[model samples]
Target: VNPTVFFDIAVDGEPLGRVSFELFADKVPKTAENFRALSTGEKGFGYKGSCFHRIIPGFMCQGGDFTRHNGTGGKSIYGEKFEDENFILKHTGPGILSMANAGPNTNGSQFFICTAKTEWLDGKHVVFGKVKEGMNIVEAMERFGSRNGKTSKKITIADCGQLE
Candidate 1:
């Protein structure tokens, strides 16, 4: 079965509940494993204290920069970056979890959760997971979003881990 992971979230230091995701491991093993292990943090670095650095309402909210904890920094477990696992998954609607990269195959630990359908990203970014619960918390994150992909408040993954 696919693993379920969760991020216990907060905004500006206030609790914002948790957001759970079900990774599509059967279809995107490489990409899914990256997210799964990162959540476990057994590798010494992970998303435990990371923040959603870029958030664009009606688009997507991004995070996973465990290194810099910002939009500009992140690294894949495979190395600094990894190839596109396969664009087999589509960004058909909201809560879609996909990688964020500099360009082609530059995927790192950075990822985003779609707030609305963004089919334009198909075949470009690797879609590996989807929100299994707490999308309302995602909406709460959107409350701090801006058009320029900035946030009015610091949105963070206060805690995170696999659901076993």
Candidate 2:
């Protein structure tokens, strides 16, 4: 139920920080696999110059858009959806990572990490991961301005690979 995953964020090779996710694999295995692919660099879709475009202070910071390195929606792969209501996890607190989608069965690479309780988002988005460390980095990124819930600041994944 509690699976740990690491995340390293940086700009220009300067380490922002390292964070971890306690995943709920049983609830959303497909979503987790997409995340794993992005993190491990096995999927080239998410690489340097990507962004955390959607940010709502005291709410959540969202990213995972593979188009134009911001929140600009474009061509991207969407994963099959699951019945999330049966899942135990909910987006009711900070540090929770959930899928961002336009509608059912339309989840692309977009995701968000909660900065505070967001019970409203529960059951609407898939709660697949939770931040275990470096939440400050996520908060710091949110401070930057966004355009229609998109950020021009450009938050990149830098590099992600499997843990030994």
Candidate 3:
């Protein structure tokens, strides 16, 4: 039942930091798989070069739009949408990672790290992981990175493997 994972995020430009998360795959396997696979360049494809396209100061920092770099693109390794889980977890507080989708059954490579309380997205999005470490770094992304979609600073997953 152990499903912990780790990943490093390096922010380019003057404001930079490396952060990691201990993903809870036991809660959402498919969602977590989609995330980890993309982060690690599964199938020779990944979400490495994507930018933090939508950084809302008090809400969350949305990214992982691997292709378009905007909030409009990115897909899953499964090649199509998958069904949502029962979502035993809640988007109760900050640093909780959740799938970002256009609607139900629309989750793709795009995801978000909640920088602030986002109870509104509880059932609407799959809460797959939380920021077990470096939450401050995640928040820093909201305050420091370029808010526009044109942001160049790379927010990549340096590692995505089992933790402990």
Candidate 4:
């Protein structure tokens, strides 16, 4: 409920900066558990290197695809779907991390970080956490171009460690 998750991204061995996400347990319990499972290695949500494949400057960044060696593909959708009205959280500012899905009930492990405020997606996506640090890193990452213009330079999550 009060846990802080840290994500360390790097190229080769260089540190890109740490992204700390504070989970909102009270808001979305199941979503938080899924995220914890992935981070703690309880589940293999991000085993292979999945880069931030899509980045629309001034919009957002997307990742969490398990199929492609890069961020080109993701697993088939699985998990419960919450009604937009039922969700208590709001997708307001930057660092807002939420579950990405094909539809309302298709949320998988994929998610995105809002580089700018996205009011339209409010209540639709399950927002379980927010980036506590490294906003600049997130911004810098948005600058890189992708092979499809959506995928960026291969950025490895390195390893998601326990909150310090």
Residue-wise lDDT of candidate 3 within 62-83, one digit each (tens)? Answer: 8877788777888788875666
Collision count for each candidate, in order: 0, 0, 0, 4
Model 2 worst lDDT window (10 residues): 74-83
- How much does candidate 1 score in TM-score? 0.97
Q: Assess every candidate by TM-score.
A: 0.97, 0.79, 0.83, 0.82
Q: List the RMSD of every prediction in angstroms.
A: 0.8, 3.2, 2.7, 3.2
Question: Whose TM-score is greatest here?
Answer: 1
> Which ranges of candidate 4 are over 4 A from the true structure?
44-48, 69-85, 145-149
Tens-digit lDDT track for model 4 on 43-155? 54553344666677777877776566444455532343333324678888888988787666667667788888998998678788888888888877777744354543566
State each model's CA lDDT, in order. Answer: 0.91, 0.67, 0.71, 0.69
Worst 10 residues of 4 by lDDT: 76-85
lDDT of 1 by residue, 64-88 (tens): 8877776778887899999998988
Superior candidate under lDDT, 2 versus 3: 3
Better of 1 and 3 by lDDT: 1
Ranking by lDDT: 1, 3, 4, 2
lDDT of 3 at 139: 70
TM-score of 3: 0.83
